[PDB]
Design a protein around this ligand. Structure first.
Ligand SMILES: *[C@@H]1O[C@H](CO)[C@@H](O[C@@H]2O[C@H](CO)[C@@H](O[C@@H]3O[C@H](CO[C@H]4O[C@H](CO[C@H]5O[C@H](CO)[C@@H](O)[C@H](O)[C@@H]5O)[C@@H](O)[C@H](O[C@H]5O[C@H](CO)[C@@H](O)[C@H](O)[C@@H]5O)[C@@H]4O)[C@@H](O)[C@H](O[C@H]4O[C@H](CO)[C@@H](O)[C@H](O)[C@@H]4O)[C@@H]3O)[C@H](O)[C@H]2NC(C)=O)[C@H](O)[C@H]1NC(C)=O
Ligand SMILES: C[C@@H]1O[C@@H](O)[C@H](O)[C@H](O)[C@H]1O
Ligand SMILES: [Ca+2]
Ligand code: NA
Length: 419
């Protein structure tokens, strides 16, 4: 496997602040291909300057040929909270509508949707008028909408879109799912699907394949990040209403963080494992988790694998040259190709201030981690475009550079693979 070509584009100047607001691990998602176009969302500084930001949405044609980016600026909502939780997630439903939810740390939902199905019936003009106003509810559904953190979207097989988030706080919170119908344009409440018990679950993402929805998490006792413990897993066969553990045992609704039956690896507190890192269902139905810990005596990224025979394995990701991360260092992701043979670790290196692209193969039990490429000059939790990789064999990664404001840019990097 080789990188046929490497290309990059600078899409904006990052915003100034001691917190990172662009390029955050739990953006789900930041960079999305739908049809012949790729979309990206990020904050850029408003004319009022420091601590005033607008959400931007970029689009570019990627098929049959790659076109230039164009951007719209949502200049009717000013982000002002210098808090790294307050990121943007985007989703695109099967009616072609683009959804955005953003700017939360334990506050009411902020959500907006495009007026029309702009990703399906593609308009000539890319302007802010394409979007409806910010609202603080989900039409057709019901609260609670506050105190909300961590909006995550997941597109389903019938064109519908899940929106998932935590209601509560670090160390005492629960998570909820809502479902947007592409046929009616209405949201519906699926209710609380995971319930804390003087703690909160921190999921790594949502993954969906062939009618099944997969998630993994750690449990946090207090606002101190050293109090994460456990690696847990569950899946649903009905888009988040009913859940099962790794042994196919049906779980209570909601899943309780006190239910040990979803635990797949014992990791104590003070292991230097961080919440909300990465996960992946590969196209062959193998489930993967990316975390980190100090338990070997060295800080190392860790790969958890749910094998076909039901067994789980854990193996350090330690290819030559990769510096292992401690608790507060930037978090990585796992990507997979259409065939399911290639597993990509998109791993920020805290020493090099760059993002490494490493590859392992299913034929070698994913133990053959090899350096494949690098994105230089990043201070980012890298995020990729699942659909572009599956459809075109191009690994496309959104990054925040390292360096100082206003030199520090936002970029998209495309690694064309010889798949
Ligand atoms: C339902 O699903 C669950 C989840 O998959 C399943 O439970 C697993 O069952 C398998 C098979 O019986 C267990 O696998 C064995 O594990 C042996 C060691 O287990 C200990 O270590 C686990 C790993 O953590 C270690 O390392 C970390 C650092 O990464 C460290 O923090 C830990 O402390 C520990 O050192 C650990 O998760 C596990 O904890 C469970 O069990 C204890 C009690 O023992 C409990 O207190 C915990 O709360 C938790 O439930 C435990 O501490 C391992 O030696 C053994 O290896 C042999 O077999 C393999 C075969 O592949 C050989 O390769 C190998 O050489 C040995 O011969 C084997 O891998 C696994 O531990 C269970 N996992 C959990 C989370 O419980 C249930 O069985 C399923 N139930 C049904 C009905 O289907
Ligand atoms: C460790 C800490 O945990 C949560 O508060 C968020 O994920 C935050 O981004 C991370 O820095
Ligand atoms: Ca996802
Ligand atoms: Na608590």
């Amino acid at each position: 496997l080789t990188v046929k070509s490497t290309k990059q584009w600078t899409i904006g100047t990052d915003v100034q602040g001691s917190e990172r607001l662009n390029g955050v691990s739990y953006q789900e998602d930041a960079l999305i291909t739908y049809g012949d176009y790729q979309y990206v969302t990020f904050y850029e500084t408003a004319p009022a300057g420091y601590l005033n930001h607008f959400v931007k949405v970029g689009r570019r044609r990627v098929s049959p040929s790659v076109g230039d980016w164009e951007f719209l600026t949502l200049d009717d909502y000013t982000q002002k909270t210098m808090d790294g939780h307050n990121m943007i997630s985007m989703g695109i439903s099967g009616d072609g509508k683009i959804h955005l939810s953003f700017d939360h740390h334990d506050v009411p939902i902020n959500y907006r949707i495009s007026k029309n199905g702009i990703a399906k019936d593609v308009p000539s003009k890319w302007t802010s008028d394409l979007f409806d106003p910010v609202v603080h509810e989900l039409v057709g559904s019901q609260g609670p909408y506050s105190p909300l953190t961590y909006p995550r979207f997941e597109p389903l097989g019938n064109g519908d879109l899940l929106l998932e988030f935590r209601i509560g706080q670090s160390g005492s919170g629960d998570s909820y799912i809502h479902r947007y119908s592409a046929s009616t344009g209405k949201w519906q409440a699926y209710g609380m699907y995971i319930q804390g018990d003087d703690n909160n679950a921190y999921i790594n993402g949502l993954d969906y394949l062939d009618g099944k929805l997969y998630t993994s998490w750690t449990v946090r006792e207090t606002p101190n990040a050293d109090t994460n413990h456990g690696v847990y897993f569950a899946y649903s066969n009905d888009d988040g209403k009913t859940w099962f553990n790794t042994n196919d045992t049906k779980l209570t609704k909601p899943i309780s963080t006190s239910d040990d039956s979803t635990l797949i690896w014992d990791i104590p507190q003070n292991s230097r494992m961080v919440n909300q890192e990465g996960q992946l269902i590969d196209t062959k139905g193998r489930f993967h988790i990316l975390m980190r810990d100090l338990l070997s005596g060295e800080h190392q990224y860790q790969h958890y694998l749910r094998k076909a025979d039901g067994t789980w394995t854990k193996n350090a990701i330690n290819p030559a040259g990769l510096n292992g991360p401690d608790l507060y260092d930037p978090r990585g992701k796992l990507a997979g190709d259409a065939s399911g043979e290639y597993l990509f670790g998109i791993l920020p290196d805290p020493v090099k201030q760059s993002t490494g692209i490493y590859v392992a193969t299913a034929s070698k039990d994913f133990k053959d981690w090899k350096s494949l490429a690098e994105i230089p000059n990043t201070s980012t939790e890298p995020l990729f475009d699942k659909t572009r990789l599956h459809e075109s064999g191009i690994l496309s990664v959104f990054v925040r550079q390292a360096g100082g404001f206003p030199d520090r840019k936002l970029q998209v990097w495309d690694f064309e693979l010889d798949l």
